[PDB]
Every structure is written in C-alpha cells, then in structure tokens.
Specification:
alpha/beta, Spore Coat Polysaccharide Biosynthesis Protein SpsA, Chain A, 8-stranded mixed sheet, 3-stranded mixed sheet, 7 helices, 11 strands, binds galactose-uridine-5'-diphosphate, binds manganese (II) ion, transmembrane helix
C-alpha cells in the first residue's frame, strides 16, 4: 500500500447542512459499514499519515451528537483519515469544564492507538465543505473559521473556539489545555495564548471552504459565563506551566464502545 494522495480524490466540496431532519444512528451505522466499533476508521486503499483522535467535550447533547455523527463520518472517510471518535461525557451536575474534558480526551485516546493528531470539536459544529480537512498541519489549526453564527466572519483574528487541531507534539509543547476554566468562555483564548507563548502560529483554511454550521441552541444550566475568565486569560503566561496536562486529574467511571463512537464518562471534579 502507498501513502494516500495529498488531496483526497473523493472530496465533493460544498455540501448541504441542515438540522430540521430527525436522525437514526442505526441508518447511520448501516450507511457507513466501513466504520468499526468505537467509531474507528482506517483507509483501505492507502496509508494515511494522519492518525486522528477526534475529541468531543460532552454532557446532555445526544441530539447534537446524532447530527454530528450523521454528517462527519461520511466526510472523515472521504478525507482519507485514520480516525477515531471520542465523546468525553462529564459525569455529575457540577459546572461544565470544556477544556479539562478535552485534556482527558487526549490522554484516554492515546491509550487506544498511536494517534499523532488531535481534533478538538464542539458537538454542534458541522463543516460545510469537505475540503476543510480535519487533520493537523505545520502549525496549530483553527478549523471552524467561518461559522454561520458569526456570519462567516472570524469574531476577531485570535479566535480559536469551535473546532481546532493540534498534533501530539504541538499539544505537548503547551502542556495541553488548562484545567482551571469552569463554566463558559475564555478557555479557547487561554489556549490561543499558550500557542503564541510557545512561539507557534494559527493555521486556517480560507473563509470559503472553512464555512461551518452551528446547531442553534439555548444556554446550558451549569455552564454559565465564567466571571473569572477575563483575568484568567490575562495571566496565561504564568499559569500554563503548572495548569495543564501535567496537573490533570480525573476518574474514568465508565467506557462504552458504540458502533459510531467511544463514550468515556468521567468525573473531572468541581471548581475549587
Ligand atoms: O452542557 C453542556 C455545555 C457544553 N457542552 C459542549 O461544549 C461545547 C460548547 O458549549 P456551547 O456550544 O454552549 O458553547 P458555545 O456555542 O458558546 O461555544 C463557543 O464558546 C465556548 C465557550 O466556552 C467554546 O469556546 C466553544 O468551543 C465555542 O465554539 C458544546 O458544543 C458541547 O460540545 C456540552 O456538551 N454540554
Ligand atoms: Mn454551541
């Protein structure tokens, strides 16, 4: 077998993405027979150099996940990636911690396979163009650059929210993501700050092929705006060395392998 082409020859470009249609994971599993237990997929015709672990922070978003799975699997296969889906479900009813869950994802996924690339994605963001490859690049990759919720514009040039990708080494070089951001906001700016502090830059696809749709939803109880985010992000320089991968603690309560993804339910503690 030879190395897959640089550009998948299966891409179709723009696609129609809509969320008023109800979904059935059974049909999805059927329509994607190539996807193995735990939502694992490995190209058959060639050797993909992208061993992608796709991490999804999660709690009470089953319907969104449904759409996410319905749309992404077909796309990730067309992108010729050797990938796996990880839904990191936060146990309990305490404050949501997106960044911490992503860290857990990084660690737990590595126990399964020698992934060298990590895509961190909100459960509610779907790419509108399969040319927007869910893989890693020479530099940290911001993937959801043109969100319809922001009218296809980047809210500000340093925005790193939504969907992003870091290679194993890029992730490691910044001591991962912070674990101290409880509730909504700022964790993505901290991560951006970490990348810059390590002397890295953000790579992005152009605003056309980077178009993506957000599933409209209301706010979630237990993920209210974090009032401390403003000055927490103003101090990333001093906290990234001690807050991150090296200080990550958590308890996996249960691991379940479904046909389209692996669900890891974890106790990641509470704000202190
Ligand atoms: O109860 C919750 C809360 C959050 N999430 C997960 O965390 C993500 C972000 O939460 P929301 O979609 O409510 O957040 P927003 O739409 O504001 O998302 C945007 O703002 C966030 C602020 O923390 C993040 O930066 C995120 O990546 C960015 O796209 C969700 O997609 C989902 O994957 C859950 O599963 N359950
Ligand atoms: Mn959202």
């Amino acid at each position: 077998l030879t190395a897959c082409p640089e550009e998948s020859p299966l891409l179709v470009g723009p696609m129609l993405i809509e969320f008023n249609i109800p979904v059935d994971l059974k049909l999805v599993e059927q329509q994607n027979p190539k996807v193995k237990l735990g939502g694992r997929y490995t190209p058959m015709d060639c050797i993909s150099p992208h061993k992608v672990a796709i991490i999804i922070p999660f709690r009470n978003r089953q319907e969104h996940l449904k759409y996410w799975l319905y749309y992404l699997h077909p796309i990730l296969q067309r992108q010729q990636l050797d990938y796996g889906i990880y839904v990191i479900n936060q146990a309990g009813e305490s404050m949501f911690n997106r960044a911490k869950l992503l860290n857990v994802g990084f660690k737990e996924a590595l126990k399964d396979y020698d992934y060298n690339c990590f895509v961190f994605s909100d459960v509610d963001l779907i790419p509108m163009n399969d040319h927007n490859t869910y893989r890693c690049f020479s530099q940290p990759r911001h993937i959801s650059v043109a969100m319809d919720k922001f009218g296809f514009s980047l809210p500000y040039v340093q925005y790193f929210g939504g969907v992003s990708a870091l290679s194993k080494q890029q992730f490691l070089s910044i001591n991962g993501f912070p674990n101290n951001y409880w509730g909504w906001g700022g964790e993505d700016d901290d991560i951006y700050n970490r990348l810059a502090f390590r002397g890295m830059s953000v790579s992005r696809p152009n605003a056309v092929i980077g178009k993506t749709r957000h599933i409209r939803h209301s706010r979630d109880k237990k993920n209210e705006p974090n009032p401390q985010r403003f000055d927490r992000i103003a101090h990333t320089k001093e906290t990234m060395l001690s807050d991150g991968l090296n200080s990550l603690t958590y308890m996996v309560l249960e691991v379940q392998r479904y046909p389209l993804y692996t669900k890891i339910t974890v106790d990641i503690g509470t704000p202190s």
